[PDB]
């Protein structure tokens, strides 16, 4: 397991323009297009960023590739951020995933968990498990922000081989 695998999995692949839990036009393996409710906007945003006129459907190559920019996107948003490099750098190469997770879902939305961040960099894990609980993200998507915070309490990829 490793990350794209791990994104893979909670993401999974549609090649045409879809709503995400939030109801926002996404695309690929969880690419979001926008926020705006314009479908028009939304097959802008796509054609710009495969670079041709695509009428809002891709192939699975297209796919790949825009989560290939995004997962590395997520890894470089973390290493420029002074409140989350620290705490990465900390944590061992499976929790960096989770983490990764996190931000691939609701960006740098992870400014609230300042405490949870804390208790990760202290490596309380139980301690920070029940504290990433107690958010809106785990009350809305609650089976995946339960595996990711699996991953976090353990270190192991027990709830992706699950
Ligand atoms: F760098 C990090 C980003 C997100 C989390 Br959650 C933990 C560390």
Redesign the pocket.
């Known amino acids: 397991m490793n990350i794209f695998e791990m994104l893979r999995i909670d993401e999974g692949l549609r090649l045409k323009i879809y709503k995400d839990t939030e109801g926002y036009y996404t695309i690929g393996i969880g690419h979001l297009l926008t926020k705006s409710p314009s479908l028009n906007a939304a097959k802008s945003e796509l054609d710009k960023a495969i670079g041709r006129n695509c009428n809002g459907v891709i192939t699975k190559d297209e796919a790949e590739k825009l989560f290939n920019q995004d997962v590395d996107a997520a890894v470089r948003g ?1 290493l420029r951020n002074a409140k ?2 620290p ?2 750098d900390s ?1 061992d190469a499976v929790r960096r995933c989770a ?1 990764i997770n ?2 691939f879902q609701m960006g740098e939305g ?1 400014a609230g ?1 300042t405490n ?2 804390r208790m ?1 960099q202290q490596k309380r894990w139980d301690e920070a498990a029940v504290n990433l609980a107690k958010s809106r993200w785990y009350n809305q998507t609650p089976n995946r922000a339960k595996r990711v915070i699996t991953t976090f309490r353990t270190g192991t990829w027990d709830a992706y081989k699950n």
């Open positions: 973390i989350l490099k705490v990465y944590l983490a996190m931000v992870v968990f949870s961040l990760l």
